[PDB]
Amino acid sequence: GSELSERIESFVETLKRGGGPRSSEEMARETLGLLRQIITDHRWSNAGELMELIRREGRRMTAAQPSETTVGNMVRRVLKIIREEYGRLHGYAQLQSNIIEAINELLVELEGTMENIAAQALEHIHSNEVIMTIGFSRTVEAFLKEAARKRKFHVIVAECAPFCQGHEMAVNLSKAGIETTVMTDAAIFAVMSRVNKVIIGTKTILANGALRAVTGTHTLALAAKHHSTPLIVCAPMFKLSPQFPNEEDSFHKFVAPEEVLPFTEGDILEKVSVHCPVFDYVPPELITLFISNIGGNAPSYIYRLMSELYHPDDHVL
């Protein structure tokens, strides 16, 4: 009622204004908590009414921020869960406890994805290796910081030019002693002749195996395809989305251009056009392998996960 409305409005405003909260795992946990909180205090006779209600709230949540689709694909995952539960109960009153225990085991699966990636990380890192990483994410940082517990290798951290987020990852990896080397994003092809394999993360995996990620990794993947080095995307399953690339041109998230050109530049700021896209598009032909909590998958297999976690009816939400 009132508590539901103020929590939903606070969620919409904290997704509209900035990044609240910080990491994707805790916001996926609070999105699943919001979905279970909005299904325990409502009244419905048919499952289609709850389907349309979840569809309307998901439309509102993607209208809050279109580039942040983790809430959208988690709403879609809850929609496919209630769809398969209505299908297995149709072929009538015990459905709500089934959706509550399904959301509970989904939260158990979501709490142990990074430890599963760390458990399967041992078959992808050998001794005296060099590793390239762009941007910053806790998944690849935890990946490298536990893979260095038994292996000795090197990590090349290239910073990001809009927001220098590679610096905290470099000082977090250097506390574990992985011999990390900090460089810019400007000598990538100047260092790609020595990079053996590239371990990166992403923001959103698309339906065709493509991915949006932090900016500068499409160039890095082009260099990795030029030098034929394997590209390893360590991404969990809540970053998987059915949103196709050529869809209403709202792909990139454009942010304020002060990080690119500051306000103290002068009179030349009027006659210039400074853009700052924080995200970039990588096609699936430049990707070699995805690493999720269930294991490794080809970019020519992601559609099956699109058939195993989402429904083609709920693509428009």
Partner: protein, 285 residues
């Protein structure tokens, strides 16, 4: 031969109708007019009807539709034990399958037309109703783009495609058959309708397609293919000569590898070229 006459009557009554759907309708009419209470006796008559349809029509689409109809008849024979109920069940299932297939062009139209941007430059091969349907669905959503159509030297249907598309009042330009590498730098995306999709993800199509896909790889343009579900065939051509000679006849056909193809568009969705292998081994020949 009443089957070839019924196929010609089903294909000639509607010029905007495909040949594989007329072959499936002819196979359903032959299964309705057979009335033979035998499992293998119906399968032999169905195989004879598919051979008679492939002897007349030299397309790969009618052969793939016959193979899918034979797999459907084998599934209906393996599902039901008794044949008397299985005949009516197969008739009703074939009617529902034809109803689902007849609405697939609307699925391609409302599913694929979102990829075309405004002010784009489409490159289009010879005449097919799938590309014309997705282009009229693109101009139905108030989109402006320049179309470059291949002249289709063996059968002048790209000129017929441009004559059908200029009545739609869109900017259409007939380009030369040897000029698909000349206009690849200005065409930001290319959509080529196929007539047969092999298991690995490549397409069996008209002779001018594959080299254009080579021009889609050296010039990194996204090669989009629109094809329905009845054009799936359980074949694997290794080279351009491993296609069967019954589909060749100066060849009329080629093969495009799945590495040169970006995306596929079927009624089951916008799908990676690796997914037709999933559907073909989930259908089990």
């Amino acid at each position: 031969k009443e089957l070839i006459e019924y196929f010609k009557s089903q294909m000639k009554e509607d010029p905007d109708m495909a040949s594989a759907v007329a072959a499936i309708r002819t196979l359903l009419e032959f299964l309705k007019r057979d009335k033979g209470e035998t499992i293998q006796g119906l399968r032999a008559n169905l195989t004879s009807a598919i051979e008679t349809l492939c002897g007349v029509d030299s397309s790969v689409a009618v052969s793939s539709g016959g193979e899918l109809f034979l797999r459907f008849i084998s599934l209906a024979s393996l599902e039901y034990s008794d044949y008397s109920k299985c005949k009516k069940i197969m008739i009703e299932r074939g009617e529902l399958f034809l109803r689902r297939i007849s609405l697939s062009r609307n699925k391609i139209a409302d599913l694929c037309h979102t990829f075309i941007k405004d002010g784009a430059t489409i490159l289009t091969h010879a005449y097919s109703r799938v590309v014309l349907r997705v282009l009229e669905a693109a101009v139905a959503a108030k989109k402006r783009f320049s179309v470059y159509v291949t002249e289709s030297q063996p059968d002048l249907s790209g000129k017929k495609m441009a004559k059908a598309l200029c009545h739609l009042n869109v900017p259409v330009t007939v380009v030369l058959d040897a000029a698909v590498g000349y206009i690849m730098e200005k065409a930001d995306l290319v959509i080529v309708g196929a007539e047969g999709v092999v298991e690995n993800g490549g397409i069996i199509n008209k002779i001018g397609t594959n080299q254009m896909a080579v021009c889609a790889k050296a010039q990194n343009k996204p090669f989009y293919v629109v094809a329905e579900s009845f054009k799936f065939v359980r074949l694997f051509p290794l080279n351009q000569q491993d296609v069967p000679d019954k589909f060749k006849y100066h060849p009329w056909v080629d093969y495009t590898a799945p590495s040169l193809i970006t995306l596929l568009f079927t009624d089951l969705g916008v799908l990676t070229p690796s997914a037709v292998s999933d559907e073909l081994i989930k259908l089990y020949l």
